[PDB]
Amino acid sequence: RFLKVKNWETDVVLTDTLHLKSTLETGCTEHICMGSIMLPVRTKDQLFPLAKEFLDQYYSSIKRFGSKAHMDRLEEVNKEIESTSTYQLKDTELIYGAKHAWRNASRCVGRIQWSKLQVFDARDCTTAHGMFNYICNHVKYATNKGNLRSAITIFPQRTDGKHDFRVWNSQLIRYAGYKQPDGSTLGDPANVQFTEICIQQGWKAPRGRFDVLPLLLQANGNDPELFQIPPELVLEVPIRHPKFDWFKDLGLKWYGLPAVSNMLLEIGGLEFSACPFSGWYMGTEIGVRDYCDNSRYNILEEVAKKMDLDMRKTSSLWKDQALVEINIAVLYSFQSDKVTIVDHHSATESFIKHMENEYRCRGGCPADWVWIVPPMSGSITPVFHQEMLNYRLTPSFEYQPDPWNTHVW
Amino acid sequence: RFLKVKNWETDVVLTDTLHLKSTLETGCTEHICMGSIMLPVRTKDQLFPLAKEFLDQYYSSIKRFGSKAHMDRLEEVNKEIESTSTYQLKDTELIYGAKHAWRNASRCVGRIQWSKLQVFDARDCTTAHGMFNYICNHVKYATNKGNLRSAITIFPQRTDGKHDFRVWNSQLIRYAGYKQPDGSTLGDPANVQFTEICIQQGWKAPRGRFDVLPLLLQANGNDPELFQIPPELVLEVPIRHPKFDWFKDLGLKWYGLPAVSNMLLEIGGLEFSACPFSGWYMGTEIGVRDYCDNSRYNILEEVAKKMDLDMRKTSSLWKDQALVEINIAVLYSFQSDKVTIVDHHSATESFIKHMENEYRCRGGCPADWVWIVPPMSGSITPVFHQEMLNYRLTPSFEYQPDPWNTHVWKG
């Protein structure tokens, strides 16, 4: 019930007690581990225990647990739920909640940063045009001319579930994908379905390889509307290599701002279904996953050829050699253009320091090793050798399914 | 019930029913996943059900379930248990059991090979000298002058737990490690403690960087005895690089035969505490883990120095660049000397084919993603994108603690 985690490289042992505060279910059982599975309203009765649990943790954090102001706030919230079937968070509670949802995000390697998060309260937003304005401002603030700053923008909470705010896009900034008569895919194959929905709703597609998608915004449960983010707000980086002059000839670019827009933020039982957030990239996301996944831009074969490597046998490790060069290029290009990026060595080193901080100050740190270990060079980063316990704490970010299933037009 | 797994690269979905035959616990609960935790005598009462479950599985596999031969064997084993507190496996059952423990080993990427396993029955062994001879024969057979063949040697099972056979070595072939007074290590830092034990037991250590360790063998719960494997039986490969001629002067070599000697084989409730087994290497084990782990030979810096990489910032990815060249060197060296080895691209592609076949014919394939995904270039292998279900089937191989912690010294 008190659990140990060992680092096998350093022999450092840490004791986890924080897991006893976990509430939600993992998908694992005593008989079966689902650690590698990607995907393993509320009544008046359900809501007050969730609110109380959150408010207790909040008052504890500002060292006024059990105080008159603590008790008075639970009373106020209880009265509000009984009378209105929901409640409203104070600004201080919203900021605390959002920061802790990131602190609790077990799949995030970048959580050393969790307390530096700019929270934009968009709970007064009522229309899709309002949503577009908030999102442009988020984009501009976070981008900050390349000196990226972590931010979240929080739209109104769920009510009856028929008036949801949703950003239909999976990220604020992504590239279009189109199925070709030729049979191949042009652009990002990951975005073919979404690009189609955009065209159906009226988007005039440039039909290129790196077309920034428009936002499809849903306010108050209405049908979503299309908006183009001002091109001058979307900072993009041309990819070149410090040694290979031909690398720029591939015509690769990526955008500077990673901004997740499809998750659900739960704070004290309240559900924020549109809460786009952003930080900055770890280079392997772009160089390993976006560029080299077979189902993505899939560029390994082209780079390997330009490198004149022996592609006749797998054991020459041509894929591995080209992978490294692609990742050198991504980091170099971002660094040369003064756009914030972190390499996987540096990000995982910081995460180990964050884990030790959290064990020290909080009694643990939920972490999902399958996601935390980078998709290349796993065992030469310190997280590979670090045992991690994965469990679910609230406030939380949760995946939600694409709304084009949910939505009735 | 039915559990589904998806491959996120192919959208291929598979359905697991095999997990319903899982008995043992994972370490995980509804509230906590322990998937990255490395370590998450029986009564008559507990033994006959385990025996029966195993014999039922064995007789099904031979299409004789419920036959007179099946029923007679259940009866025979039941009588043996009630009267002697244990029972003996037939040779055929032992072979079946050992093959299935491999087939069930969820951390093993090499399982496409499971049904091709040479089983050496060493249950007539009585002394450490006898163990030494069996192990020499296993090494010679498995090595096969570089054309490696999978094998396992099975010593007598546990009785009262006071008479255990154990190989104290974690692998049959490993290099010594020596902590120096200045805090540095000569040789393999993974083997410092075991090396100190060998020396205490009377081994004359050459004190070099790649000294093959002697075997330390316990028969019948007696104190272990030291034996040197004949050097002519230990195949080794000097490591060189196809394009970098200075790579040879790093002085690196490795042994060809990976042979795990510290695991416990459970078949039908019986416990084989000494069951050394061997296959062949995947290149990354040596080039990534043995050479490049910080707590092992730790050669990354020296290699990248010689490659004249920019080592001022981790973001030049010098470690990644040096890692790839070291792994090319290991594969090239083994291949050039005609010693069996498999690269991680080939091994993972074969594992996916194995797993898909297993889902079709067996209803599942337990797999531990944390271990199956290679320690370099993870996502450019198909296994990275494959959802896996981890659960425990028997027969099985299990970790057991090192014997020096538990051994009752007799003197």
Ligand code: HEM
């Ligand atoms: C400050 C720089 C940040 C870095 C370097 C970083 C790093 C990462 C990385 C590499 C991943 C895995 C991404 C993937 O493979 O899809 C991730 C996941 C995630 N992070 Fe962060 N992160 C940062 C900021 C943030 C912020 C600001 C938040 C929320 C306020 C956040 C919450 C999450 C969540 C919920 C996931 C899982 C996403 C999913 O399930 O798709 N992170 N982080």
Ligand code: HEM
């Ligand atoms: C034939 C070629 C084989 C290949 C290429 C192969 C590959 C591997 C690899 C790469 C690992 C992980 C090693 C590590 O990180 O320590 C492993 C683990 C393992 N394999 Fe295999 N394997 C082979 C044969 C065998 C055989 C013959 C057996 C037993 C009969 C076996 C049973 C196991 C077990 C029990 C583990 C887990 C070891 C532990 O927990 O320490 N494998 N295999």
Ligand SMILES: Cc1cc(N)nc(C[C@@H]2CNC[C@@H]2OCCN[C@@H](C)Cc2cccc(F)c2)c1
């Ligand atoms: C089925 C499924 C479930 C789930 N929870 N997430 C996904 C999204 C899948 C999971 N890895 C690939 C795809 O996301 C890529 C976007 N993630 C990055 C931008 C997150 C990020 C990084 C750095 C900073 C930051 F703020 C956010 C899919």
Ligand SMILES: Cc1cc(N)nc(C[C@@H]2CNC[C@@H]2OCCN[C@@H](C)Cc2cccc(F)c2)c1
């Ligand atoms: C705490 C702990 C638990 C556990 N189950 N295993 C270990 C052993 C740890 C696990 N990775 C490092 C150390 O094994 C090194 C040996 N592994 C190879 C030889 C297995 C193998 C490969 C190829 C063929 C073959 F037959 C066997 C440690």
Ligand SMILES: C[C@H](O)[C@H](O)[C@H]1CNc2nc(N)[nH]c(=O)c2N1
């Ligand atoms: C099947 C497996 O769980 C899946 O491919 C995971 C593995 N680890 C990952 N890790 C990160 N950071 N992001 C991912 O998308 C994935 N994909």
Ligand SMILES: C[C@H](O)[C@H](O)[C@H]1CNc2nc(N)[nH]c(=O)c2N1
């Ligand atoms: C902490 C973590 O579980 C541990 O370092 C694991 C990760 N994956 C591994 N995978 C393999 N094949 N072998 C290992 O020793 C390990 N070590």
Ligand SMILES: [Zn+2]
């Ligand atoms: Zn689990």
